[PDB]
Amino acid sequence: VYMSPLALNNLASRLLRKISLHLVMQMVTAVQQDLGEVVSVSSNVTNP
Amino acid sequence: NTALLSRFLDATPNLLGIYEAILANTYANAVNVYCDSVYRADIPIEWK
Amino acid sequence: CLMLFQALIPPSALTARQRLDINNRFAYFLIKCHATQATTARLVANQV
Numbered sequence: 001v002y003m004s005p006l007a008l009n010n011l012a013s014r015l016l017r018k019i020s021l022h023l024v025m026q027m028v029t030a031v032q033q034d035l036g037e038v039v040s041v042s043s044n045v046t047n048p
Numbered sequence: 049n050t051a052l053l054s055r056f057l058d059a060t061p062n063l064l065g066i067y068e069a070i071l072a073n074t075y076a077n078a079v080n081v082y083c084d085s086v087y088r089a090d091i092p093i094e095w096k
Numbered sequence: 097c098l099m100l101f102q103a104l105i106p107p108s109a110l111t112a113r114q115r116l117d118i119n120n121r122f123a124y125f126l127i128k129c130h131a132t133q134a135t136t137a138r139l140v141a142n143q144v
Contacts, residue, residue, distance in 0.1 A: 035094075
């Protein structure tokens, strides 16, 4: 496979097609509002 | 300034009124489940 | 007012951040208005 750029590309191209991830996440807005306060209540000047 | 502040200090006892309106509901303030007096510092600040 | 207000509320009612600022704003006030030209200078020299 590693003798030909075409061959390698084809194999890689294929190997990746199969990955299928599915993650579970909290509501963004919720986290950004919570962490939001944590920052505001404790920061002395607009925290970057 | 000295005047206004003088009258101010002379009248602070009027604040007694708040103390009353609060103490008036002694039973209501204590005979219940929600009241507490110990500061659990570990409570997440975003919950407040 | 701020000084009075401090008698109607337990520490728990104010941000541990601000509670600290207040102490500082007070120290500023002391050093600025009630400290000797000689007292100030000593503190500054000792990096207090």
